[PDB]
Symmetry: C4
Subunit: 225 residues, 4 copies
């Protein structure tokens, strides 16, 4: 006999949870200002515990609502919720007492999993990755090649941008979004070594040609089916 999971299904529960999420966003936004936060700090304390208490129980409900002896964690969107809320308790007295603030902020992000028409949208929007999941390998290969060619040439011409392999990856990420690829990056270097342009004029091309076929390949297969 099990009179627990019979009418355990609810409808207006989602409105409760979304109101809680929006109230948490409104709470944590206010925490940003310094003068308001110090003065109202006493009031806020009881609230974080209160909000945390409100969440945990409402995910334990879902835990003991849909066949606990089943794929509750084999599914997605539930492992995620549990990870966030449980980290909520685990980092409550962590030596790093401040990551709790960032995670409290990140809490609201579950508002895409508790409402329909968002869960479905992000589900499709992420399942589309393995479609273009091949050109990414190409834009990694042609990315590392230049990231490691540049750093051995322009290492003593401009240590700021091309200082080292991991610091020269950031620059070749700046130059592929076409952001000051001629005011800060190229021109000062090009003023020193004369044949350097063949490295930027051949990266803003062979690099914008893949970001282009990314678009085309995700626009063809996403239309055909």
């Amino acid at each position: 006999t099990s009179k627990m999971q019979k009418i355990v299904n609810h409808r207006a529960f989602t409105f409760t949870v979304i109101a809680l999420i929006l109230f948490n966003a409104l709470i944590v936004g206010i925490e940003t200002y310094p003068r308001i936060y110090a003065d109202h700090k006493w009031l806020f304390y009881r609230i974080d515990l209160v909000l945390l208490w409100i969440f945990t129980i409402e995910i334990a409900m879902r835990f003991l609502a849909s066949n606990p002896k089943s794929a509750f964690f084999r599914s997605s969107w539930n492992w995620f919720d549990f990870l966030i809320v449980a980290a909520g308790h685990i980092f409550a007295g962590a030596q790093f007492v401040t990551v709790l603030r960032i995670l409290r902020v990140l809490r609201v992000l579950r508002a895409i999993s508790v409402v329909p028409s968002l869960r479905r949208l992000v589900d499709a929007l992420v399942m589309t990755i393995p479609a273009l999941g091949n050109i990414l390998i190409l834009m990694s290969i042609f990315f590392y090649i230049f990231a490691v060619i540049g750093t051995m040439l322009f290492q003593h011409v401009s240590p700021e941008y091309f200082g080292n392999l991991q610091l020269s990856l950031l620059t070749l990420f700046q130059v592929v979004t076409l952001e000051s690829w001629a005011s800060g990056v190229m021109r000062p270097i090009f003023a020193e070594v004369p044949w350097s342009w063949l490295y930027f004029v051949s990266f803003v091309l062979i690099g914008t040609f893949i970001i282009f076929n990314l678009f085309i390949g995700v626009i063809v297969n996403n239309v055909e089916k």
Copy 2:
């Protein structure tokens, strides 16, 4: 008996209205220069009243031309016209005597509602919003998350850009159009805190990936039907 709304329909009337609109644009453009305006101020006065008088009557015509006891205001494009022209009279002697100038400028904008092939174009171009009216919610959620994560980290590292929640929204709007996201925004901060790049390199990605599916989603459904 009603011999009013029988031949009240007109054809060349639209040419009168469009000539008036273009003349109003030409009038208000000249108002910009200071030397010309002060000298010709006496001449201009009689004109604003004259143009205002010309409009009001020609919208009252439409008011008493197509079944006044019907959906004259339940429709759109008429509520808009009436709002603009009536604000014309309401702000004529407002304590704010200068908003009348901006609204006089904005008057010409009705040139999209008085001519065909523009009304239809803007009608479709705005009705397409509820199609992508879902990804906007996602680009608001993932927007607020970073807008409130950044402001609590980089609040005492660069008060100019990330000074406060409402002043840090503008910056994260600058960095999503890829405008000086490495010359002004990132590099000075990144020179202070070392692991900050994971916040910009993970916003120019997870933020240009939604502006991308915006494009794709509005290019698929706008082709299929």
Copy 3:
């Protein structure tokens, strides 16, 4: 009897003309350097006249080759050729003796009309304009509105960018290609008047939303037929 326009049709003639065009490009490029030009000026003179003489006759041929008593000028691509080459002679001794240089440069541009697969490409690529020939009117209206709203507000806050109606059109053209719309244009102004952002944050949106439907509208009708 007319034994002129019988075998007047030619095949290898196009190779002669394209070789002449490429040689003219190679000639005029060299003219750019100053040291080379002064020294070789004597040699160059005989060449411009020689090239000009070579052209004129080869367009007079076409004039008297395909039914001169027909639509030789009602067609396009011939009126263009004749205009360029005839300007060649007309500006030979013009009071402006230097526009002849720019027009000599522009001469090579006819290389798109004398070779196939380019004439056809540019023909289609320009005939596509009346398709989107409607959104352009909208991007002119919403362009003038802001171009004349901005100049009356920010006329004594930054005369460089928003100095006058014709000088403020250039700025609102800069801000619609998303080029330093927050480093040079907005931020200095926004530091003076506080509520100014509502003018740039509402132009980089309602202005990139039309440049977007430009793309979509020219990608739908250019696929459907």
Copy 4:
């Protein structure tokens, strides 16, 4: 009798080669840092020879594995491999002893030819060029025209950007990716000669209109078939 090319076909061989490629990438990346390289230089030497020895033999295998008396070099992707690896030996004692380093870096690039689903992807991604292989000619013609018009006007107004035909090509490449086309390039010049804007406002248009039809033309034919 030929008992050589009977069971010469292999399967796990590709895993050997890809492990070698990844190990070469990991080896050459470390070479970038200076302190690590000098100290570990003795260890590295034996490795370059070892890796080089490992490659050469494994391409000679393929040479004598698939009908050497056939189109081994008439094919592609094999001429490329052989060119790279053979340059490996040819530049081993070159007067330029340092290009060997860059070529050692470039060695890893063959990781797109030794694994499937990459060879096919790059094959299609390059075979698509002759489709748009016509608009490129147009974007070369309209490119040279402005590249040689600008250099004769703005040669004594700003020698930095428009110094000469080959140095003014770089600038008109900067201005077509819309990168500081109003902060560095235009505004300083435009402050000197007044009617110069008609050269940049008519290049950022007639130049972004071809990069646009590039997109459209490669999105239509790449969908239709």
